Amino acid sequence: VQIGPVTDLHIVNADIVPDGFVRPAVNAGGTFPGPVIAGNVGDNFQIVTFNQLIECSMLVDTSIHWHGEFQKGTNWADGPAFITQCPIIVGNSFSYNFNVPGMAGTYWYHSHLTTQYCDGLRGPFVVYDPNDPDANLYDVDDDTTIITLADWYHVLAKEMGAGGAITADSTLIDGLGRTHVNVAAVPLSVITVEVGKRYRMRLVSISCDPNYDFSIDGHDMTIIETDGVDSQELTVDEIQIFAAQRYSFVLNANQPVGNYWIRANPNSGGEGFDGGINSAILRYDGATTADPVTVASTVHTKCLIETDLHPLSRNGVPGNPHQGGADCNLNLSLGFACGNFVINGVSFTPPTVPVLLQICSGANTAADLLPSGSVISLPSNSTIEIALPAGAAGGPHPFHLHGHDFAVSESASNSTSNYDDPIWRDVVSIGGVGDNVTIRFCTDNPGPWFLHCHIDWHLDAGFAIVFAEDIPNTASANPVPEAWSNLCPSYDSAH
Ligand SMILES: [O-][O-]
Ligand SMILES: [Cu+2]
Ligand SMILES: [Cu+2]
Ligand SMILES: [Cu+2]
Ligand SMILES: [Cu+2]
Missing domain, CATH: 2.60.40.420 (Cupredoxins -  blue copper proteins)
Incomplete structure (x- = not known):
């Protein structure tokens, strides 16, 4: 079933038996997978999410991410818990209201609280192009x-x-x-x-x-x-x-x-x-x-x-044709030890106050932002390069960046860079030990953007950091609705 671009999406508990084995689930729009959310490029999406969850075994809080949607100007609508919002509490609702300028194609949406998408909250998101080439x-x-x-x-x-x-x-x-x-x-x-x-x-x-x-x-x-x-x-x-x-x-x-x-x-x-x-x-x-x-x-x-x-x-590739050929080049140390993953020695653990609220409250630098060691600021209108050398416990890890897609300058199992015409995408396998998968993008979207392994079990074990893109302009670029401001007081009072 397709719904949208303006629609209600109720989030409920339901037992389901997709393989013949009945167990509890967390459902978007009452089905598994969730209904397809659809619209045409340039459409305004207004998704009113009604949290009706009762089964604590899978958490009665929720938060929804529109995976691969850039959310420029609407970082508040992105969905990752404690990066861009507090979770919606059961019995409340929340309007994810955003546009998708420039984007078309095949996406999806999922719970971005803890490991809750595994428990059933996941479905397809298609933006149709009336002039699809x-x-x-x-x-x-x-x-x-x-x-x-x-x-x-x-x-x-x-x-x-x-x-x-x-x-x-x-x-x-x-x-x-x-x-x-x-x-x-x-x-x-x-x-x-x-x-x-x-x-x-x-x-x-x-x-x-x-x-x-x-x-x-x-x-x-x-x-x-x-x-x-x-x-x-x-x-x-x-x-x-x-x-x-x-x-x-x-x-x-x-x-x-x-x-x-x-x-x-x-x-x-x-x-x-x-x-x-x-x-x-x-x-x-x-x-x-x-x-x-x-x-x-x-x-x-x-x-x-x-x-x-x-x-x-003719996307090409931003920057210069050699490693480090960018304004801000990064090389991430991706590790695993004792049941936890680290990025530059820090395991991600969600802050009490969402990163975006922290900034809106007056934080100016990555140094000002919690969690400590889990935030890397990026300056505006700059070519970023991120090398992501594999090796960390299995693997192969699909890395995803929110708010952006990116040129894959170097892929898995292949040490030859491509600075001419490599594919662009939003989730990339970083391959195997000795690989050096490398991505490039431009910073044209102020907001705190999640970079993490899309193995959800690995995300809960800390395989994530936040790129705080253009902290100074974040508040001005992303005016928030009152309902967003209401989230954290609700969540914190309830807990
Ligand atoms: O995007 O998870
Ligand atoms: Cu995702
Ligand atoms: Cu995403
Ligand atoms: Cu992983
Ligand atoms: Cu994500």
């Missing part, structure tokens, strides 16, 4: 062509320990999938196609942790969009998709009428496809209603390599 490439782009991949857990998030290796208990494709252990024959999702039609498939990782090797038996996939950024056409037969990443790909329904497995193998949890785990069904209209008996290719000959992607627009 990729339009002519396909016949069908709508709610039936969105594909969510989701890790599902039988253990309540709050009780995951932590960390501590944590693994999912099944993979759900469009909200349905089978358990990894003691697999019950529960309903699988179906994606239906018509012989000779081309589909814009919107592949969305709403994962709390694993990356997926995604493929469709018998079929190619032509990537045209990556994390919101239009890409040149790239035909692959497999897609490794890390947590929070998105791809639009054209699926040409050119095979014989029949049933074909859709495969999503996670990097941890259940391996393979026995009994229909890690699976959904591509069915052609006219096929018999039965399980596919198809097989994956023994070897995928054109799997996605990030370095093969290029923006469709």
Whole structure:
């Protein structure tokens, strides 16, 4: 179902059994995944979130992030708890009111309090482009062509320990999938196609942790969009998709009428496809209603390599073509030790007063801001470079920056930088030990912006820092509504 751009979104508790195992959940809009929030580029989004949660086992507070939306001028609407807001308390509501100038494509939204998105609060967010340059490439782009991949857990998030290796208990494709252990024959999702039609498939990782090797038996996939950024056409037969990443790909329904497995193998949890785990069904209209008996290719000959992607627009790369070729160049020390992650020696632990409120209250420098050692100020209209060398305990870590997308100057498993035409995106795998994944952006968005691993279990274990972009202009750029000012008094009184 699609709702928006002006809509109510109620947040409730509900037991669900997507793999046949009933457990509690935290739901946005009453379903899993949450309904698709949609609009056209330049639309004003007004999302009235009603917190109706009662089950403390998963926290009755909440806060929602519109993942990959820049929120320029509306840093208050961004959603990360204790960075840009206090959580909304149960029985209250809050209006996330923002615009999406300049942006189109495939996004999602999720709880950004603690590990609550794992417990169910996650759904797709699509901004349609009435003049999409990729339009002519396909016949069908709508709610039936969105594909969510989701890790599902039988253990309540709050009780995951932590960390501590944590693994999912099944993979759900469009909200349905089978358990990894003691697999019950529960309903699988179906994606239906018509012989000779081309589909814009919107592949969305709403994962709390694993990356997926995604493929469709018998079929190619032509990537045209990556994390919101239009890409040149790239035909692959497999897609490794890390947590929070998105791809639009054209699926040409050119095979014989029949049933074909859709495969999503996670990097941890259940391996393979026995009994229909890690699976959904591509069915052609006219096929018999039965399980596919198809097989994956023994070897995928054109799997996605990030370095093969290029923006469709002439994005280029800001700054100078050598490492450090930026106004403010950073090299982050990313560590793990004794169950906690650190960025430049500091494990992130959320401050009592949100970073944005701290600034609005009169803080001027990163030194003035809590948590200590967890904030790096950036000056305005400057080219930033962030090298993010891997090595820290598994891994591979998908790093995400709020309020920005970014040129991936260097990708995983490949030590050659690209300063000409690398893909831009918002979530990037930093690869493996010895890698040096490097990103670049410009500071054109004053506000405190979260940079963290999108493995949610890693975020709760402290793998995050805040880029306090243009602290001096933050208050002026982001006027807040009274309801926002009301949040922290409410939260703090209730707790
Ligand atoms: O973005 O989490
Ligand atoms: Cu996110
Ligand atoms: Cu985000
Ligand atoms: Cu991580
Ligand atoms: Cu985030």
